[PDB]
Amino acid sequence: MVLSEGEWQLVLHVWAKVEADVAGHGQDILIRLFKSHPETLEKFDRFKHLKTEAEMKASEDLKKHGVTLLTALGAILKKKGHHEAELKPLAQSHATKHKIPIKYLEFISEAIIHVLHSRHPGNFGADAQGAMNKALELFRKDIAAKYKELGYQG
Numbered sequence: 238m239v240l241s242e243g244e245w246q247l248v249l250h251v252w253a254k255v256e257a258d259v260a261g262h263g264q265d266i267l268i269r270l271f272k273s274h275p276e277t278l279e280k281f282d283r284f285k286h287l288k289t290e291a292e293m294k295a296s297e298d299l300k301k302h303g304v305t306l307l308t309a310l311g312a313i314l315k316k317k318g319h320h321e322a323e324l325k326p327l328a329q330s331h332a333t334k335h336k337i338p339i340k341y342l343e344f345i346s347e348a349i350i351h352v353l354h355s356r357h358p359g360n361f362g363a364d365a366q367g368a369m370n371k372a373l374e375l376f377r378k379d380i381a382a383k384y385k386e387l388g389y390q391g
């Protein structure tokens with residue numbers, strides 16, 4: 238797939254707002270993911286034990302990962318589709334070490350779109366959401382093709 242420059246603009250305009258508070262957005266997104274799809278919490282051997290949203294909000298580790306995650310995602314979006322190099326090391330650790338099925342990357346994509354829609358309604362109207370959705374589908378498709386070359390396709 239190929240996003241037009243206009244679509245990338247809509248994606249990088251609402252991303253510039255996320256970047257004013259990377260850690261808070263990281264928290265929101267992961268919690269939304271763990272409340273909606275609890276099974277995903279099992280993949281984190283470091284968080285696993287958290288029983289409630291309050292415990293999640295108070296975990297420094299969960300907040301640290303959220304920052305790591307969003308920083309990596311932001312560096313991939315700013316490439317505007319030329320993200321081959323960034324995707325290699327990511328695909329290898331998620332396919333071979335963590336073992337994150339494609340389906341879970343769809344779950345966090347949904348959590349990302351839920352959180353932008355709540356926080357940024359004015360910069361996240363229908364067209365901007367369709368463009369973000371296009372940019373995360375692109376990301377999932379290229380990661381899935383790399384999973385396959387690596388022997389996982391999960």
Ligand code: HEM
Nearest residue numbers: 277280281283305306309310326327330335337341342345
């Ligand atoms: C937007 C998608 C994602 C991005 C950009 C992303 C990024 C990362 C990055 C940069 C790291 C650290 C370096 C590495 O291990 O490769 C990481 C670690 C990890 N990620 Fe992902 N990730 C994504 C989605 C997920 C999802 C959906 C899950 C699981 C339900 C997952 C589970 C983890 C785990 C288990 C680790 C290790 C955490 C720790 O113990 O240090 N990732 N991810």
